[PDB]
Symmetry: D2
Amino acid sequence: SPSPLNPGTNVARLAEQAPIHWVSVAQIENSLAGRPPMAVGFDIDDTVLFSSPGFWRGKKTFSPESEDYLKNPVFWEKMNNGWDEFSIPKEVARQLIDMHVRRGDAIFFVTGRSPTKTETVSKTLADNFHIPATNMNPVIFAGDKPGQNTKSQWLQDKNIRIFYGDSDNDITAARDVGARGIRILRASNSTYKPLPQAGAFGEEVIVNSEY
Amino acid sequence: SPSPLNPGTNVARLAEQAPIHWVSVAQIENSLAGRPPMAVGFDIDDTVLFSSPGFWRGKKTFSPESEDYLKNPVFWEKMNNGWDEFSIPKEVARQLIDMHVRRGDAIFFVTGRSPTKTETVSKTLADNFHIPATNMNPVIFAGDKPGQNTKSQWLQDKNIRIFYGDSDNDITAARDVGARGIRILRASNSTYKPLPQAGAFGEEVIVNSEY
Amino acid sequence: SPSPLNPGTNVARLAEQAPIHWVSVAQIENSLAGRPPMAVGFDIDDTVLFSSPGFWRGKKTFSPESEDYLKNPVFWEKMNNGWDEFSIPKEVARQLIDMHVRRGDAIFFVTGRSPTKTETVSKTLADNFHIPATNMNPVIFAGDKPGQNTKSQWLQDKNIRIFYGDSDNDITAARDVGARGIRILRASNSTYKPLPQAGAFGEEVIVNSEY
Amino acid sequence: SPSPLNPGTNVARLAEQAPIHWVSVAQIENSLAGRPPMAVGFDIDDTVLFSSPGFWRGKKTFSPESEDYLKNPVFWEKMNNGWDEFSIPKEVARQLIDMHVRRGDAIFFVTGRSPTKTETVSKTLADNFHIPATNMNPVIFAGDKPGQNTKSQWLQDKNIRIFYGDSDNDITAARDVGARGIRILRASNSTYKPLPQAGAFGEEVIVNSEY
Ligand SMILES: Nc1ncnc2c1ncn2[C@H]1O[C@@H](CO)[C@H](O)[C@@H]1O
Ligand SMILES: Nc1ncnc2c1ncn2[C@H]1O[C@@H](CO)[C@H](O)[C@@H]1O
Ligand SMILES: [Au+3]
Ligand SMILES: [Au+3]
Ligand SMILES: [Au+]
Ligand SMILES: [Au+]
Ligand SMILES: [Mg+2]
Ligand SMILES: [Mg+2]
Ligand SMILES: [Mg+2]
Ligand SMILES: [Mg+2]
């Protein structure tokens, strides 16, 4: 700073590109041509669902000033049992999942959300993305609590070869097990802030994956 | 629709700019410096609230395979009386509303949503955006009637001198009454598509106003 | 800093716009519709000619480590009498000058280059941009030396209403006389560095004017 | 060709990225860490030198209204024996050449320019880019023969493992011999048009490499 009234710009800044390995769904699919059906995984939040409406609602209802709602079982019971009806499915996920289904791939969802006694997230996902039951697997609630296993342990267990996610820990989880971690852009209107530096580990990042 | 696997790019395309009158909130405040309190107006949907969650939910509930929910009074009762709890306030609106409160301006919201018997929208707005009683005015539900701009007469009636909105009809309403129409970007994960061409009437467009 | 190996990015940075009043040649022309023929002015370097080849040559020949060549009469005699045969005309200038000629405008060039006993720059310009002799005026070498007048004094003297330039002093010269200063982007391969903050004064900046 | 006066834009277009493998010089150096000295090669025109000044001049002098100058031996004598004094070294090339000198790599320049009896190009390059005698190799003038890639056999002959260039033929030459072909952006003010689609073979493209 200063942050000027009239900052101006220049054509070096206008054309400036960060050195990122951008990919398209079409190129990922091409990279898989001739590879046998495999298990692939997806993070949920900001990867396949824009779920910030429910998280916003939860914050505003359960902990208006902090992020305490994120460890409130009452919030999770609401979040995992219907508030995703207000979540907005990502077109990038529609494309990815359609093409993995077309390959005959096993599709897993592995989330850091807290587990709840029941969940309708598996159903919301299978329904919105038209995932055959054959390809579909119930959502895995991963983590460090008693009775849980971490994202990484789950990726190893289900032999997941590709993991799509928006968060750094999605990519490092894939890397820890030798899986191909592929980054999805977090939408700038997500309430999960700050936005990750997509590409921060040299991973592939999907173009235009914010929606 | 297919496209090349590796389309590539060039630095003319990388640097290319559309000829848009981009402005900041600071520049708008600066352009108004010295001007006494006035009435100003805001569209709601995709201008101050990312409300797609409620509309997406409404469509799924009331008209899965059409747009009839938008003409269903039961949908409007829900949307206007609680589903905005899932609507995500936009940062640009926080900045704009803060600036107009600093100015002592009278703030109006003029929405194309259908009027309902009761509404909790004015409450959600005055709360989310920390709007003092004196600057706040109850939401004007101008409704929607294709072939007709239902906002124009309201801007005239309330002597609104600046109108903010994401849609072409917001800008044309301001133009109709000789008010300064200022465009806000609709977020790319909005379910209201296609995205408008912000800048299409030569109007000012607020930078980074998608979130 | 750090300047990371793998910086990554996010979609707020990807979509980020500086708040600049970008214009196109088409919009400038539209803004002039019905305005009588007038005098308009152009800076030369990085506005209508990419002349860095001659300046590079001059530096390398006359002052390899400093910018002393810029005050070397021997350099100027070479620069103003043929080295612009290696200067690359800007498409943005072709468009501007064609449209000002089509309007019947008087066209002036006002440069901070040092005057020389003879110059072939006026000819290079008239020839490359197909400027009728009627519209064309000999290049004005402006400045602060004995026997010179400043850019500003020249703009006042020739009643210039619009001045196109890439440098801050081009825009301030127009502003000092009440003329409309319009910014052209300096190409990032110019050897005149650092690049200006185009738009730093709230002036109009021509889209894609780096070439 | 006409286009809308105020086309506008949207945030999907603002944020849109082509799926390009963008890399930095640091990332390239990092990918090579541990590898002993090797032969590497560079195209010249629009890869290390903005040489449009000499080509533009040549066209004006030898074939104002065609491309015949490119097949004129008198043009090549001038272009190869002094007109590069007007050619502007690219910063990306300074970074690349510095990095390959750090590595102890053997550096070759393989150009489509026609061989001439004498050439001062190798001198201009070794001087401009501060290239030690040991890393420097005399420029290979491979010439140009449409229908034939004249570079491929030279990369084979010199055991070149990495080839840098702006044109499709640079990348295809590297591919022909199983070398790593890396694209540099052609500057938008180059008179060699149209601009190539950098990234069109899925090859790495160097960020900000237009200058
Ligand atoms: N503010 C937020 N908006 C949307 N999703 C969130 C937010 N905070 C956390 N998440 C989700 O991302 C998961 C990663 O652990 C968290 O468990 C949570 O379910
Ligand atoms: N490095 C450069 N490359 C191109 N043009 C230059 C450079 N330095 C100055 N100029 C030109 O811009 C003019 C502005 O005063 C100078 O007089 C000079 O003619
Ligand atoms: Au890599
Ligand atoms: Au202005
Ligand atoms: Au609507
Ligand atoms: Au060529
Ligand atoms: Mg996530
Ligand atoms: Mg709206
Ligand atoms: Mg200049
Ligand atoms: Mg080349």
